[PDB]
Design a protein around this nucleic acid. Structure first.
Ligand SMILES: [Mg+2]
Ligand SMILES: [Mg+2]
Ligand SMILES: [Mg+2]
Ligand SMILES: [Mg+2]
Ligand SMILES: [Mg+2]
Ligand SMILES: [Mg+2]
Ligand SMILES: [Mg+2]
Ligand SMILES: [Mg+2]
Ligand SMILES: [Mg+2]
Ligand SMILES: [Mg+2]
Ligand SMILES: [Mg+2]
Ligand SMILES: [Mg+2]
Ligand SMILES: [Mg+2]
Ligand SMILES: [Mg+2]
Ligand SMILES: [Mg+2]
Ligand SMILES: [Mg+2]
Ligand SMILES: [Mg+2]
Ligand SMILES: [Mg+2]
Ligand SMILES: [Mg+2]
Ligand SMILES: [Mg+2]
Ligand SMILES: [Mg+2]
Ligand SMILES: [Mg+2]
Ligand SMILES: [Mg+2]
Ligand SMILES: [Mg+2]
Ligand SMILES: [Mg+2]
Ligand SMILES: [Mg+2]
Lengths: 386, 67, 136
RNA sequence: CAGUCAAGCGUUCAUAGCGACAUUGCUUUUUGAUUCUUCGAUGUCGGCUCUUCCUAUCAUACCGAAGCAGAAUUCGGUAAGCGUUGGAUUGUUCACCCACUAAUAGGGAACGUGAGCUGGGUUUAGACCGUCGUGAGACAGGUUAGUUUUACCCUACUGAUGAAUGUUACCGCAAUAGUAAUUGAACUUAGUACGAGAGGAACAGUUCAUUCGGAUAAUUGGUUUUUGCGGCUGUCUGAUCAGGCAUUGCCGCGAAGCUACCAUCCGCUGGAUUAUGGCUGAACGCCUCUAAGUCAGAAUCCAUGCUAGAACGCGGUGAUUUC
RNA sequence: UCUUAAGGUAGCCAAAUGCCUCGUCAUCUAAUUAGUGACGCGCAUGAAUGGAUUAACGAGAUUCCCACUGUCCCUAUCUAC
RNA sequence: UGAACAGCCUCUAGUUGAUAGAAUAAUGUAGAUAAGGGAAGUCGGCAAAAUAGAUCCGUAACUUCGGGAUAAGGAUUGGC
């Protein structure tokens, strides 16, 4: 017979399969539509998720109850040290899809970037790009010819850049290499932009800007093998259920004599690649500046790093990106930040944001103070003090 | 913004932190965390707890401010 | 919410499912209120309709004068007793659940309010605000 | 369940909406008829949980007609994309009321689903009452108590490794398969259009909310074997300090992690169409959205985007062993 | 008025005994095929086939109320094997 | 300790026997805790939770006058 009472589904059928992602770094499967009018610039960036915090900002939305009144929101902080442009690759369109035809690398590579190419760096001759380096030492023989080959073809040009993992508190010691499509114009100019940037760094402030509407692309937090009840949010069976109750009672009818692909079943949860859209940047921090957490109303010399450092991460000595909301992926994970695909007015994507105060209290518990100067001022002197 | 003062322990309460409690007689009590809130629910006298600011002032500890 | 809903309110945590007994906060002579429905609530399998601060509900008097017994009437919740987060960033809650009696238009049957009332409920029903003593 | 004809109803008027007398069909969600398969056994009602499908569409999207001034309503089309509830009584399917909602539409999948649950009913053996029988006993008459077994095999499904493709590593492409967002309210429009008045909208805009989904732990709450700190009982170590035991001795707080519409954030825009309304324009010197041609258009379809990446699809790139 | 050997008296009841039946009225609930109190031409109650009531007692059946609680809204976490 | 050959700890005496090692996924078995609500779940409060000792106060209808009765409902409890 039919279902006694109609109820919506559980989970999302468009997010299958819920298997582990291919790699720890999520891959950007689409880039903003290119217009050959603006100057050549990146369309994405690489960063690391440090942690979340609490921000206080005066909401400005005509008609709303809290218009011109104070609200409290939670944002996540992403450490974004500048990346190094090492190598560009061109893509020629084919009736079978886009295909890379050539790759031109930089003459010199840092130690951290080439560690990606070795599964055992400690016992190795470290002969990476050594003979490719010999392609240089002549003016332009083997390289400029390849660059010209890219110019004559390769309607889409992407740039290979790698993070400076040594600048982060992580003990990773291995860089992350990724591609970013350039959305300037006159692809001949695109490769000129890339070649001039070989062995050169690019700061995050040259890509993203305050109040800009961006997107986050990262692999979520894995959780191993998971029961059906929590993997899909199904109803728990009654208490007096034999042979367990954290299950799904009926997984299919007699016909078809198979288990449907749309029935919730136990399997690995998390560690999937996700693309979270519509996240608004609030502050573009600069590592070469104290008082990172100081607003025009706070005016206290305190960095974005809380007391005792970010939980499980450390400090934010580098430039950082802090975006409203929460982005997928846990702390210490590589995260790729992307420009918005389409222009969105929405009267909230055009909102101008100016912060008031940053919660720098220690996240290792119910923190009370914001600065050891304040802590000493409040508690007074102690036995440890002389 | 205006930083709050805890009703039980006097600790400074920053925006978005702690819990606010309104008693039936319309008096409001703000607790910086669950620790102070729970002790308040057990009718513990702030004067008898050794780390509250009220106790410290009452017992003249670190009171070198006023002469 | 409903006919008397003058404006909109932000979402607040539900703390009063149906079947709850709630204190009567006016002078109409009712002692408690029994929830049987919530105005504006959605539908879902096995999901009990739940009431929050400022929500108009279909309530029934369980203790009070007999002419208020045995009949259903609208009501408006004025105290929640379950913590909810205001968008200014604070979590607040009263010590008990409380509400009043009102017609479908929102005109309160009683004339006075005992105890404090929530600012969300007062800001939304003008009539409740007028008779409210202390608003928070 | 749907037609065909049209005596009448409908102030006049068959067909706005109905429609008698007749007549043609469709479906197998009723109940019948037959006994074709199963009696060396296919686990029978109902409820709970869950998935998908059908459309004879309840609402939501867009339209057509009226005995459509407005509002409300009724008939109809494209439409199964999305949703269709919480309760009182009954074992109930069914039924009847309370209430919310946009609505509380109808069905199938061995009258879906018992090695998924329950056992309230039916449907063993105990027992009671009424009627019947002299009697043993009978009663789709009523009542109460009455064991719910096994998956380690194959396939299916969800996840997870994996040889051979000179070796290894890195960066990619995208065939294919899946796909998602949904709905309501309030203000403004506007007490305006419309109407004698009674009453009384809509388009654009704004703030939110319902249901659903993917994440996340800054805050709040929960969780305590951090056995982290403190306190308390009985006993044991001559006493103190410090500790053991009481299957974590008990209580208060309790970081980290996990976690909650009990917490926070987020959930895109292009084309082609359906119904329908139009253009030019013959057929048919007139006329006609149609015959050729053609314009706009639905929550429709395909795309943008999102997910997996063919483990016998592909590309670029680094290095590529010398007792 | 026919008829039996006598024609259900005292009592009791939609009761564990009533098909029609979810009987009718009141109460109980917002809503009750449940419960209780009444009515009784009672298919088919009824007197040691024992009728009616009954304090106390009951791992007997049924209804409601208070306190209580993860039974549930709506799930989450921890420990041992 | 305590009313107590109750439960809990110890002395005399007797054992240290039950295949082990390493991790801490899902579902389990056993033990638990949960904010707001409080039976709305369910055939049915099934299970679980709540109360509990002792001292003092107070204790209804009904009744076979014996009971009901620990009725119900309250207050106290340590150490010196
Ligand atoms: Mg259905
Ligand atoms: Mg979740
Ligand atoms: Mg069982
Ligand atoms: Mg923390
Ligand atoms: Mg806590
Ligand atoms: Mg249910
Ligand atoms: Mg047969
Ligand atoms: Mg047979
Ligand atoms: Mg056989
Ligand atoms: Mg079988
Ligand atoms: Mg149709
Ligand atoms: Mg059938
Ligand atoms: Mg079924
Ligand atoms: Mg089966
Ligand atoms: Mg029997
Ligand atoms: Mg017998
Ligand atoms: Mg006989
Ligand atoms: Mg029979
Ligand atoms: Mg496709
Ligand atoms: Mg916790
Ligand atoms: Mg024309
Ligand atoms: Mg008899
Ligand atoms: Mg003694
Ligand atoms: Mg003893
Ligand atoms: Mg053994
Ligand atoms: Mg139910």
């Amino acid at each position: 017979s039919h279902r006694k009472y109609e109820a919506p589904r559980h989970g999302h059928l468009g997010f299958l399969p819920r298997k582990r992602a291919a790699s720890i770094r999520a891959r950007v499967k689409a880039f903003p539509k290119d217009d050959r009018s603006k100057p050549v610039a990146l369309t994405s960036f690489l960063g690391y998720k440090a942690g979340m915090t609490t921000i206080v900002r005066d909401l400005d939305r005509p008609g709303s109850k809290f218009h011109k009144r104070e609200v409290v929101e939670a944002v996540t902080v992403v450490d974004t040290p500048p990346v190094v442009v090492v190598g560009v690759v061109g893509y020629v369109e084919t009736p079978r899809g886009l295909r890379s035809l050539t790759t031109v690398w930089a003459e010199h590579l840092s130690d951290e970037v080439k560690r990606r190419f070795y599964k055992n760096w400690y016992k190795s001759k470290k002969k990476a790009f050594t003979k490719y380096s010999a392609k240089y030492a002549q003016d332009g023989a083997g390289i400029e010819r390849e660059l010209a080959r890219i110019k004559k073809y390769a309607s889409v040009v992407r740039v290979l850049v790698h993070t400076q993992i040594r600048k982060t508190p992580l003990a990773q010691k291995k860089a992350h290499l990724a591609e970013i499509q350039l959305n300037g114009g006159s692809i001949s100019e695109k490769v000129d932009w890339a070649r001039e940037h070989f062995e050169k760094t690019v700061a995050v402030d040259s890509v993203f800007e305050q109040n800009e509407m961006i997107d986050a692309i990262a692999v979520t937090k894995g959780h191993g093998f998971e029961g059906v009840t929590h993997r899909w949010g199904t109803k728990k069976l009654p208490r007096k259920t034999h042979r367990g109750l954290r299950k799904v009672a009926c997984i299919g009818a007699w016909h078809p004599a198979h288990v449907m692909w749309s029935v919730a079943r136990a399997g690995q949860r998390g560690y999937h690649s996700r693309t979270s859209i519509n996240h608004k940047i609030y502050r573009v921090g600069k590592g070469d500046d104290e008082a990172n957490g100081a607003t025009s109303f706070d005016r206290t010399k305190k960095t974005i790093t809380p007391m005792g450092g970010f939980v499980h991460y450390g400090e934010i000595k580098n430039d950082f990106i802090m975006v409203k909301g929460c982005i997928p992926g846990n702390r210490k994970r590589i995260v790729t930040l992307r420009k918005s695909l389409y222009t969105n007015t929405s009267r909230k994507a055009l909102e101008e944001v100016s912060l008031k105060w940053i919660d720098t209290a220690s996240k290792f518990g119910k923190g009370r103070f914001q600065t050891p100067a304040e802590k000493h001022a409040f508690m007074g002197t102690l036995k440890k003090d002389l | 913004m205006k930083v709050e003062i805890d009703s039980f322990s006097g600790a400074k309460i920053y925006p978005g932190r702690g819990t606010l409690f309104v008693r039936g007689d319309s008096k409001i009590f703000r607790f910086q965390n669950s620790k102070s809130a729970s002790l308040f629910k057990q009718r513990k006298n702030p004067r008898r707890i050794a780390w509250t600011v009220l106790f410290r002032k009452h017992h003249k500890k670190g009171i070198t401010e006023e002469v | 919410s409903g006919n008397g809903a003058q404006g909109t309110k932000f979402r607040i945590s539900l703390g009063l499912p149906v079947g709850a007994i709630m204190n009567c906060a006016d002078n109409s002579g009712a002692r408690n209120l029994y929830i049987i429905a919530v105005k504006g609530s959605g539908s879902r399998l096995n999901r009990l309709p739940a009431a929050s601060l400022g929500d108009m509900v279909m309530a029934t008097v369980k203790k009070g004068k007999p002419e208020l017994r045995k009949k259903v009437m609208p009501a408006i919740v004025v105290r929640q007793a379950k913590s909810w987060r205001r968008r200014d960033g604070v979590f607040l809650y009263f010590e008990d659940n409380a509400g009043v009696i009102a017609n479908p238009k929102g005109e309160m049957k009683g004339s006075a309010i005992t105890g404090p009332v929530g600012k969300e409920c007062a800001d939304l029903w003008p009539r409740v605000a007028s008779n409210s003593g202390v608003v928070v």
